[PDB]
Amino acid sequence: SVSVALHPLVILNISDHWIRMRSQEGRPVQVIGALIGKQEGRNIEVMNSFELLSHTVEEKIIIDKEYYYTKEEQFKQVFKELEFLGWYTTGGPPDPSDIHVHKQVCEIIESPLFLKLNPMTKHTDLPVSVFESVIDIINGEATMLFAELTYTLATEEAERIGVDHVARMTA
Numbered sequence: 001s002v003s004v005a006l007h008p009l010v011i012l013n014i015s016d017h018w019i020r021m022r023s024q025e026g027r028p029v030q031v032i033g034a035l036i037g038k039q040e041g042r043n044i045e046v047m048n049s050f051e052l053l054s055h056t057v058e059e060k061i062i063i064d065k066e067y068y069y070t071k072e073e074q075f076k077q078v079f080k081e082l083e084f085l086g087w088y089t090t091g092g093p094p095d096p097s098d099i100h101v102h103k104q105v106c107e108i109i110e111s112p113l114f115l116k117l118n119p120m121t122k123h124t125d126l127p128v129s130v131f132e133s134v135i136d137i138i139n140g141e142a143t144m145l146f147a148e149l150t151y152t153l154a155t156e157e158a159e160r161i162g163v164d165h166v167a168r169m170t171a
Contacts, residue, residue: 001042002039002042002043002044002113002132002149003042003043003044003152004044004046004113004130004149004150004151004152005043005044005045005046005151005152005153005154005155006046006115006128006130006151006152006153006154007037007045007046007047007048007153007154007156008153008154008156008162008163009047009048009049010035010046010047010048010049010088010115011117011126011128012163013033013048013049013050014031014033014049014088014090014115014117014128015117015119017031017033017049017051018031018090018117018119028119028120030061030089030090030091031051031089031090032051032052032054032061032063032087032088032089032101033049033050033051033052033087033088033089034049034050034052034068034071034072034084034086034087034088035048035049035084035085035086035087035088035112035113035115036048036049036050036075036079036082036083036084036085037082037083037085038081038082038083039083039085044085044113045154046085046086046113046115046154047082047154048079048082049088050071050075052064052067052068052071052087053067053068054101060097060100061097061100061101062104063087063101063104063105065108068108072084084108084109084112085109085112085113086105086109086112086113086114086115087101087102087105087112087113087114087115088114088115088116088117089101089114089115089116089117090116090117090118090119091116091118092116092118093116094114094116094131094146098114098116098146099133099144099145099146102114102133102144102146103144106133111132111133112133113130113131113132113149114130114131114132114133114146115128115129115130115131116128116129116130116131128151129148130148130149130151131146131147131148131149132146132147132149133145133146133147134146134147
């Protein structure tokens, strides 16, 4: 149980990653990355994200750890006060592939957040969901599942040039 505030930039970044990869590959593809921000007590503020490299090995998605560590290192050289908080991907509801990848991310951080963005909604006006993992037992054995969390959009400073300011210009 945590409270989660999401900065608009995170949502825009993830959609951007998906749009750019779809253009590059000529088809929609799943994209994966890191969530960055701050946590104080049970309160998590998700401030930014960045793309991560993965490889498909024996038909499974493997996060490139060496890529991640270099990427994190460079990010922290600039943003000294921010921390890795979890990971994101795109698609529908959480699935067994997400579970397999989440277990890798659990090797980087204790209790990573998981954010999924659905790039194929036409109806929902914020196709983003956030999860934490839980280990449930029902017929003998530990089973990792995702529990969905409520989130809010993070309050931003008056001097920030944010989504409202820029949206006034686009249309």
